Design a protein around this ligand. Structure first.
Ligand code: CO
Length: 214
């Protein structure tokens, strides 16, 4: 779902970045207060793991791409504030060193994948636990819902572009497809393939982690 450079207006990029700043600021303070050095390797591993699985995507006509993220997996294991930083780091490296997702679109992409995805996933995860579902199942359901919420956010950011940024003749200045295209396109991919892959990967790793072995 990574948004490439030029898909979003500079104004949209600026708003998303200004929203993402307080988040990461708060995240940073939360982690500083309750993580000790020994916990830092786990963030970095989670970060490298999310990066790796995100590289495996499929283009979506009408949208951007579809791939898993591991956002809820990081959120259930590191806490959402630390998942935030790990996931954002992965996105930073992807954009800056690999050209995957635009640089100015970084506030947008991290808002979707490094904020919405793990916080929705974790919230859902806590809910399922309170319904007495086991951690493996709750995390997997949280994963599905989280990635789909991020897909929706992405689809809405893109879809608003032709509506808000066009020439006097009504020609799109950036992303050219509206909500009518972007939402069914992005949501269909994520409700039926990417969400499931995400759920499976989340539950699997969570399972083996709980087993501490195999
Ligand atoms: Co993406």
């Amino acid at each position: 779902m990574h948004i490439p450079e030029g898909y979003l207006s500079p104004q949209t990029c600026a708003v998303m970045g200004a929203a993402m700043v307080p988040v990461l600021t708060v995240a940073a303070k939360k982690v500083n207060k309750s993580f000790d050095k020994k916990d830092v390797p786990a963030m970095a591993i989670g970060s490298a793991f999310a990066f790796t699985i995100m590289m495996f995507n499929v283009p979506i006509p009408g949208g951007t791409t579809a791939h898993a993220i591991g956002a809820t997996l990081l959120a259930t294991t590191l806490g959402p504030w630390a998942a935030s930083i790990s996931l954002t780091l992965a996105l930073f490296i992807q954009a800056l060193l690999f050209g995957d997702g635009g640089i100015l679109a970084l506030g947008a992409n991290s808002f979707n994948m490094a904020f919405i995805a793990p916080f929705v996933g974790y919230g859902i995860y806590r809910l399922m636990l309170s319904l007495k579902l086991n951690k493996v199942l709750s995390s997997a359901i949280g994963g599905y819902v989280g990635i789909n919420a991020a897909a929706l956010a992405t689809a809405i950011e893109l879809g608003l572009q032709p509506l808000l940024f066009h020439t006097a003749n009504g020609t799109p200045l950036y992303f050219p497809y509206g909500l009518n295209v972007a939402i069914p396109a992005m949501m269909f991919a994520h409700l039926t393939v990417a969400g499931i892959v995400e759920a499976v990967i989340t539950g699997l790793v969570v399972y083996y982690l709980l087993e501490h072995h195999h």
